[PDB]
Amino acid sequence: DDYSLVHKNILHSEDLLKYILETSAYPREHEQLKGLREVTEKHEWSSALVPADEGLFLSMLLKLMNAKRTIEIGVYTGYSLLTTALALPEDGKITAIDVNKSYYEIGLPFIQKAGVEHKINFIESEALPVLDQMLEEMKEEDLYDYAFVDADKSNYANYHERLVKLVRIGGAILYDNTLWFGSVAYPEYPGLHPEEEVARLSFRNLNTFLAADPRVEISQVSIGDGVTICRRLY
Amino acid sequence: GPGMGASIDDYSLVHKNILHSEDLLKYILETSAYPREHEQLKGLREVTEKHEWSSALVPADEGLFLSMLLKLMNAKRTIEIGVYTGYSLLTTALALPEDGKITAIDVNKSYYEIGLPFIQKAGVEHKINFIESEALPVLDQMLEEMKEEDLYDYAFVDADKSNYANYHERLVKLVRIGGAILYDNTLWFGSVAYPEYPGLHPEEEVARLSFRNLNTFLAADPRVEISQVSIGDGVTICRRLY
Numbered sequence: 001d002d003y004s005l006v007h008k009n010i011l012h013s014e015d016l017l018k019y020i021l022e023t024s025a026y027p028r029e030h031e032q033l034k035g036l037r038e039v040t041e042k043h044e045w046s047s048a049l050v051p052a053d054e055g056l057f058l059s060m061l062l063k064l065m066n067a068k069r070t071i072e073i074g075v076y077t078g079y080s081l082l083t084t085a086l087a088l089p090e091d092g093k094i095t096a097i098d099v100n101k102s103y104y105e106i107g108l109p110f111i112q113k114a115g116v117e118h119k120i121n122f123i124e125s126e127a128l129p130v131l132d133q134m135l136e137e138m139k140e141e142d143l144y145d146y147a148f149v150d151a152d153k154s155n156y157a158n159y160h161e162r163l164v165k166l167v168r169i170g171g172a173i174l175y176d177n178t179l180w181f182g183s184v185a186y187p188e189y190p191g192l193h194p195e196e197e198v199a200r201l202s203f204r205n206l207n208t209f210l211a212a213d214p215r216v217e218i219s220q221v222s223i224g225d226g227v228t229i230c231r232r233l234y
Numbered sequence: 235g236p237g238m239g240a241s242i243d244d245y246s247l248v249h250k251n252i253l254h255s256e257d258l259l260k261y262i263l264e265t266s267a268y269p270r271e272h273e274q275l276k277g278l279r280e281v282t283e284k285h286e287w288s289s290a291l292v293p294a295d296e297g298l299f300l301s302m303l304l305k306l307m308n309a310k311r312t313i314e315i316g317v318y319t320g321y322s323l324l325t326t327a328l329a330l331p332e333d334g335k336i337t338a339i340d341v342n343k344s345y346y347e348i349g350l351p352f353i354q355k356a357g358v359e360h361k362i363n364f365i366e367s368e369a370l371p372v373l374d375q376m377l378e379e380m381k382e383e384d385l386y387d388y389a390f391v392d393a394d395k396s397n398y399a400n401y402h403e404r405l406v407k408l409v410r411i412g413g414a415i416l417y418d419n420t421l422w423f424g425s426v427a428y429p430e431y432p433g434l435h436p437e438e439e440v441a442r443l444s445f446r447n448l449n450t451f452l453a454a455d456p457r458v459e460i461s462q463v464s465i466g467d468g469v470t471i472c473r474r475l476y
């Protein structure tokens with residue numbers, strides 16, 4: 001974590017974010033999500049964690065659209081994955097993909113105690129080959145309702161070209177961190193780790209592309225670090 | 235407020251935003267909102283920006299989020315409480331299918347008639363039943379006449395800010411199980427973040443205290459699941475559980 005941006009907020013004060021979390025998020029957070037978050041807070045990459053207010057937003061979307069089959073790309077310790085698994089019905093199904101299974105094992109005991117591991121097919125791999133392989137075998141009747149994209153930041157455009165064919169018409173594709181700590185707002189942004197700058201430029205290009213992509217409708221939402229919701233049109 | 239009482243000259247929060255910079259908000263609007271905004275929404279927004287109550291207008295990024303929720307949940311029958319010039323109402327009517335139906339309520343029809351030419355030009359006024367009235371008597375009459383068959387899929391609440399809690403007690407019975415109730419402005423320019431806050435007009439302070447109480451109440455209400463979203467001035471989404 002030699003990164004520069006980890007502690008930057010997109011909201012105007014730490015006090016405002018704290019108010020949201022303490023008033024509206026933590027009281028509604030499943031005990032196993034609380035447990036998973038607290039153990040993840042001890043980890044070196046805790047800054048990658050999907051925050052608790054964003055989690056409840058993901059859950060609300062899944063329930064409002066009556067999602068049943070989803071894909072979760074970029075799992076880390078499993079906060080967004082457990083959010084999804086708790087939101088789905090008892091017979092819901094999730095394909096979860098991450099290059100690093102050791103991160104998943106940090107949160108897996110909490111997923112198991114929540115009683116939802118049976119919904120999850122965890123695949124340890126880089127996401128792009130898995131999505132390529134899904135496209136070759138995907139039957140139209142098995143298209144996903146919802147995809148959450150939170151893996152290699154520099155690769156979101158490549159994920160998008162597969163996902164617009166893997167989610168159903170009317171299904172949702174959510175891209176996490178599309179404001180990149182607010183640093184996308186300017187053509188140049190000093191002081192970044194070179195990997196952070198790669199990600200920043202990738203998101204500026206992605207945001208412009210998705211706003212013109214005729215295959216989806218979009219809504220960029222200033223929650224967490226920015227989330228762009230895409231809905232497949234055809 | 236826009237509906238009744240104090241003028242805009244007294245208000246203290248109008249120039250605040252919940253995001254960390256105006257540059258970030260401008261980036262969101264110019265990159266992701268304006269390119270996806272219907273030309274009649276653009277026209278309605280631009281005429282409304284010149285009105286004395288422009289601070290109450292639902293912004294363009296929030297509008298596209300409302301549209302996205304409506305479409306993802308396949309909403310068909312909705313209620314819009316607090317219309318003003320009609321930005322969120324036109325957003326809803328464009329999002330709904332051709333046979334969608336909206337019950338729109340506002341105490342001031344003259345505000346609505348500012349936006350009506352754009353709604354007409356957009357070709358979706360046929361979906362809208364506009365009712366000029368305070369909202370509570372209308373909702374109470376709906377409670378007496380409603381059958382389970384005709385419950386609303388979605389309600390957008392953006393009327394008298396001091397009175398959302400009373401709206402909520404009706405809407406949890408008027409929206410179907412699994413349907414959505416959205417409360418607008420629940421972060422009130424960030425001023426909800428402290429028990430005490432300096433220098434607001436009495437009406438702004440009454441609204442601030444109302445939102446602090448509402449946010450605590452909704453988080454404790456077993457009838458709904460919630461998500462408070464830091465878009466616009468804060469939107470709290472509620473989903474009816476029973």
Ligand SMILES: Nc1ncnc2c1ncn2[C@@H]1O[C@H](CSCC[C@H](N)C(=O)O)[C@@H](O)[C@H]1O
Binds near residue numbers: 074078081099103125
């Ligand atoms: N090419 C790749 N394919 C799949 N996963 C990748 C990847 N590159 C990085 N990742 C994974 O992407 C994750 C980003 S952090 C994901 C956070 C998680 N969604 C949450 O709810 O908190 C890390 O776990 C990392 O191991």
Ligand SMILES: Nc1ncnc2c1ncn2[C@@H]1O[C@H](CSCC[C@H](N)C(=O)O)[C@@H](O)[C@H]1O
Binds near residue numbers: 339368
């Ligand atoms: N008691 C009441 N019943 C119904 N409408 C009310 C009301 N008190 C105030 N209002 C109306 O609530 C509106 C708040 S501003 C609404 C903004 C609008 N939703 C948008 O998309 O921009 C004003 O038009 C005001 O006239």
Ligand SMILES: [Mg+2]
Binds near residue numbers: 048049050150176177
């Ligand atoms: Mg992320």
Ligand SMILES: [Mg+2]
Binds near residue numbers: 291292418419
């Ligand atoms: Mg409002």
